[PDB]
UniProtKB/Swiss-Prot annotation, chain B:
Lineage of the organism: Viruses, Riboviria, Orthornavirae, Pisuviricota, Pisoniviricetes
Superkingdom as given in the UniProt entry: Viruses
Chain's role: Subunit of the fusion protein that is processed upon entry into the host cell. Mediates fusion of the virion and cellular membranes by functioning as a class I viral fusion protein. Contains a viral fusion peptide that is unmasked after S2 cleavage. This cleavage can occur at the cell membrane by host TMPRSS2 or during endocytosis by host CSTL. In either case, this triggers an extensive and irreversible conformational change that leads to fusion of the viral envelope with the cellular cytoplasmic membrane, releasing viral genomic RNA into the host cell cytoplasm.
Gene giving rise to this polypeptide: S
Organism encoding this protein: Severe acute respiratory syndrome coronavirus 2
The protein's name in its UniProt record: Spike protein S2'
Region Heptad repeat 1, annotated ranges: 1-46
Amino acid sequence: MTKTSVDCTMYICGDSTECSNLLLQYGSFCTQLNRALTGIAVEQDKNT
Amino acid sequence: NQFNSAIGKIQDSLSSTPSALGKLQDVVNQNAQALNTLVKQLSSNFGAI
């Protein structure tokens, strides 16, 4: 499948510092989403 | 002779060379890390004081 990566910060905020401080203050969801996104790509490379 | 030698080669490879159990390690990692998250989430303010 297509290997997609999503910048959680930008996609949620899009170049907004105060939105960034809110979301970092909200927890560490961006890591998990990113790092599953990776896992899922490197799994695509491994299927092929 | 041959099948002995192959068993011995498996013995060195699993004795010295690392990263041979990457699958099982990865599973253990990925579980432990889901927990360390969910714990580390347990200390977020979610808008509260």
